[PDB]
């Protein structure tokens, strides 16, 4: 067949874009890694919160968090760090990220680009 382990790394993508792809999935706690735009060694962790914009039918909200980088490592407005998006996300997939506002983002399953059915 074909050897290749695809994770949750998309790459080229724009903010307004991710929102669409995510909201389209219609799946709560749907995280996805993507490479910022012409950003200097930076990343972004998008997640589709289970909280709807209005009610039962609106496109789930999208939490955009900039993932800084410290000499290879990564951090989120915190003093802590992580080997890479893997160690970071993973550690967050069990705990979760807290938003100054007062919300806790959850990452149960990533976001893959490539359906099976038509």
């Amino acid at each position: 067949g074909s050897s290749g382990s695809s994770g949750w790394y998309h790459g080229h993508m724009s903010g307004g874009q991710a929102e669409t792809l995510l909201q389209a999935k219609g799946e709560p706690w749907t995280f996805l890694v993507r490479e910022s735009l012409s950003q200097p060694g930076d990343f972004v962790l998008s997640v589709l919160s289970d909280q709807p914009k209005a009610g039962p039918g609106s496109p789930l909200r999208v939490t955009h968090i900039k993932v800084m980088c410290e000499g290879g490592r990564y951090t989120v407005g915190g003093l802590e760090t992580f080997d890479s998006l893997t160690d970071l996300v993973e550690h967050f997939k069990k705990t979760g990220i807290e938003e100054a506002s007062g919300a806790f983002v959850y990452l149960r399953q990533p976001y893959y680009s490539g359906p099976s059915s038509g």
Binding site: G15, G16, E19, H64, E99
Partner: peptide, 15 residues
């Protein structure tokens, strides 16, 4: 009218 960008939900650790 163009999507200038998207807001980023602040965090706790950070001020």
């Amino acid at each position: 009218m163009d999507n200038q960008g998207v807001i980023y939900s602040d965090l706790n650790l950070p001020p």
